[PDB]
Design a protein around this ligand. Structure first.
Ligand SMILES: [Mg+2]
Ligand SMILES: [Mg+2]
Ligand SMILES: [Mg+2]
Length: 89
RNA sequence: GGAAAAAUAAGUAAACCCUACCAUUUGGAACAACAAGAAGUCGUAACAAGGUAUCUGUAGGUGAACCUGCAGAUGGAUCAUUA
C-alpha cells in the first residue's frame, strides 16, 4: 500500500552526446504547463509532455538536467531528497 | 569757541540662516551592461535554391535562434518567349 510521492529522473540517450532528461512521477495535481514553461526558460531547452499507459504524464527535456531539477523540486517542496531518485547512465 | 565717550538717521554691507536653481566634483540604497576569447548548455536562424530564396518597414506570437501576416528590394536562384 504505497500512496507516497516518489519521483524518477531518467537520463536517456537521444543521439551521440545529445540526450533526454525524463521526469517521471509528478503528482497529477500540478499544472504541468507552468513547469514546462519555467523549465524551458530556466534551463534553456525544448521539452515535451508525454502520455503513458493512459494515466502517466512525464516531462521530457532535451539535455542532461537532473541536479538542476532535483534542486527545483526540493526547493519547491514537491518532494524530499529521499523521494527523488536520479537514474543516470 | 574747539573737542573724546555716548547716542541718532540714512547708507555701504561682511557673515549666518530660509526658498529656487546653475556649474565642477563626489558618497550612494536599488538597477545594471558592453567588447574580446574559447573544449560548457538547448537547438540550427544565416552563407549552396542552408534544404521554407534572403533582406527592409510594420504588427502579432514565442526556451532559443526565429516564425507568421501585410506592402516592399535584388544585394536573386530570372537582364530573356503571344503563335
Ligand atoms: Mg544646492
Ligand atoms: Mg560571445
Ligand atoms: Mg516583437
Amino acid at each position: 500500500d504505497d500512496f507516497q510521492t516518489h519521483i524518477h529522473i531518467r537520463v536517456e540517450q537521444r543521439r551521440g552526446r545529445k540526450c533526454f532528461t525524463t521526469v517521471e512521477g509528478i503528482p497529477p495535481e500540478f499544472d504541468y504547463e507552468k513547469i514546462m514553461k519555467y523549465w524551458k526558460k530556466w534551463l534553456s531547452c525544448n521539452a515535451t509532455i508525454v502520455e503513458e499507459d493512459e494515466g502517466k504524464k512525464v516531462i521530457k527535456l532535451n539535455g542532461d538536467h537532473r541536479n538542476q531539477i532535483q534542486q527545483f523540486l526540493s526547493e519547491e517542496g514537491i518532494a524530499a531528497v529521499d523521494n527523488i531518485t536520479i537514474h543516470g547512465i
